């Protein structure tokens, strides 16, 4: 089983205890690190930090510690857009020029491959023909990494891509079962299911429905339909969680009316989002557990927050082995208590619960 963990760059600039560079970092803790996120300049893969390239070698670095640990580098990000995306799949003179950058960027920072983020071919702005140039964009990465690797006797760098849940962004821009060939794993978002985005409360990463297809089961059950072999479909779990702002302290529920997003985190801050160090931080709140979707909510005043607890992952973790799933991905490193400050649980609570459960 595949524990995939994301490390995002700019966690380096959190405030105190909430800082968190690569030295932060358990070795053991997961199978895969990947690097996020690395942007694009000219069609050619570039760094988006002043510092990305010691935070490489120190990432990268950890493997002398481990030699079964694998890191990949992460393209893209939501707040990457489309745009790069789409002007550089749009020939196929761009395409290589992009992958043969790709190559000597992994080779020479020691990453042992690449994770697509791109969010999302077909949506955001990326037209139609996206869905077909980011199939041809991942035989494209494919066939020259296979082709690198027989000509340097180096192992074959590996190809992932990070994947939407919702049933619009996999139809508008994934042919799953032609990309499902060519890439050696699919890390599965499995959460932002709902957000402050609705102007009712719902789960973030809900397991099960209480529309119906906005649950993890739902986006499994369609990849796998779709063409991915269930060793490839790594399930994402969130180590944070989606908040609102209640438009009554009176009504608490699931489905509630909400008026927007819930107050900013005082170290994410991010309207809208908590980490999940900040939720078990939340003083004089309440917790209750959606039974049918099988996660919990907090709740305070007028503030709610639907987020994943040590239960919910184990219950997760239950789900993707009876699913037969190739393991686990996890949103993120820096979000999860990583240094066991804030909830009284150990270090890394969430993602070594997730590393317990699929050993």
Request: proline share 4%.
């Given at each position: 089983a595949?524990?995939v963990?994301?490390?995002?760059?700019?966690?380096?600039?959190?405030?105190?205890?909430?800082?968190?560079?690569?030295?932060?970092?358990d070795?053991?803790?997961?199978?895969?690190?990947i690097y996020?996120f690395?942007?694009?300049?000219?069609?050619?893969?570039?760094?988006?930090?002043?510092?990305?390239?010691?935070?490489?070698?120190?990432?990268?670095?950890?493997?002398?510690?481990?030699?079964?640990?694998?890191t990949?580098?992460?393209?893209?990000?939501?707040?990457?857009?489309?745009?790069?995306?789409?002007?550089?799949?749009?020939?196929?003179?761009?395409?290589?020029?992009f992958?043969?950058?790709?190559?000597?960027?992994?080779?020479?920072?020691?990453?042992?491959?690449?994770?697509?983020?791109?969010?999302?071919?077909?949506?955001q702005?990326?037209?139609?023909?996206?869905?077909?140039?980011?199939?041809?964009?991942?035989?494209?990465?494919?066939?020259?990494?296979?082709?690198?690797?027989?000509?340097?006797?180096?192992?074959?760098?590996?190809?992932?891509?990070?994947?939407?849940?919702?049933?619009?962004?996999?139809?508008?821009?994934?042919?799953?079962?032609?990309?499902?060939?060519?890439?050696?794993?699919?890390?599965?978002?499995?959460?932002?299911?709902?957000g402050?985005?609705?102007?009712?409360?719902?789960?973030?990463?809900?397991?099960?429905?209480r529309?119906?297809?906005?649950?993890?089961?739902?986006?499994?059950?369609?990849?796998?339909?779709?063409?991915?072999?269930?060793?490839?479909?790594?399930?994402?779990m969130?180590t944070?969680?989606?908040?609102?702002?209640?438009?009554?302290?009176?009504?608490?529920?699931?489905?509630?009316?909400?008026?927007?997003?819930?107050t900013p985190?005082?170290?994410?801050?991010?309207?809208?989002?908590?980490?999940?160090?900040?939720?078990?931080?939340?003083?004089?709140?309440?917790?209750?557990?959606?039974?049918?979707?099988?996660?919990?909510?907090?709740?305070?005043?007028?503030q709610?927050?639907?987020?994943?607890?040590?239960?919910?992952?184990?219950?997760?973790?239950?789900?993707?082995?009876?699913?037969?799933?190739?393991?686990?991905?996890?949103?993120?490193?820096?979000?999860?208590?990583?240094?066991?400050?804030?909830?009284?649980?150990?270090?890394?609570?969430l993602?070594?619960?997730?590393?317990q459960?699929?050993?």
């Amino acid at each position: 089983a595949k524990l995939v963990c994301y490390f995002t760059n700019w966690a380096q600039y959190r405030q105190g205890e909430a800082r968190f560079l690569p030295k932060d970092l358990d070795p053991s803790l997961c199978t895969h690190l990947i690097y996020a996120f690395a942007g694009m300049t000219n069609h050619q893969l570039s760094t988006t930090e002043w510092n990305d390239e010691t935070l490489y070698q120190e990432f990268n670095g950890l493997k002398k510690m481990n030699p079964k640990l694998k890191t990949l580098l992460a393209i893209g990000g939501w707040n990457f857009g489309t745009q790069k995306f789409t002007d550089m799949v749009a020939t196929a003179n761009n395409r290589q020029t992009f992958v043969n950058s790709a190559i000597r960027f992994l080779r020479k920072y020691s990453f042992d491959g690449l994770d697509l983020d791109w969010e999302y071919p077909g949506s955001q702005g990326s037209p139609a023909v996206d869905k077909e140039r980011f199939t041809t964009l991942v035989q494209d990465l494919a066939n020259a990494f296979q082709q690198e690797a027989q000509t340097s006797g180096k192992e074959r760098l590996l190809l992932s891509a990070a994947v939407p849940a919702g049933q619009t962004y996999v139809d508008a821009g994934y042919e799953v079962d032609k990309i499902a060939q060519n890439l050696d794993f699919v890390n599965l978002m499995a959460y932002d299911f709902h957000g402050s985005w609705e102007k009712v409360t719902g789960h973030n990463s809900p397991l099960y429905k209480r529309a119906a297809s906005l649950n993890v089961d739902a986006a499994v059950q369609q990849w796998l339909q779709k063409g991915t072999p269930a060793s490839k479909l790594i399930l994402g779990m969130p180590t944070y969680g989606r908040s609102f702002t209640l438009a009554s302290s009176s009504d608490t529920r699931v489905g509630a009316p909400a008026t927007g997003s819930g107050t900013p985190g005082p170290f994410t801050k991010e309207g809208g989002m908590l980490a999940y160090y900040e939720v078990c931080s939340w003083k004089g709140a309440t917790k209750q557990r959606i039974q049918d979707q099988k996660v919990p909510y907090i709740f305070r005043d007028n503030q709610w927050v639907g987020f994943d607890d040590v239960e919910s992952f184990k219950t997760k973790v239950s789900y993707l082995k009876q699913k037969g799933l190739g393991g686990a991905m996890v949103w993120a490193l820096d979000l999860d208590d990583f240094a066991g400050f804030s909830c009284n649980q150990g270090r890394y609570p969430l993602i070594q619960t997730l590393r317990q459960e699929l050993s």
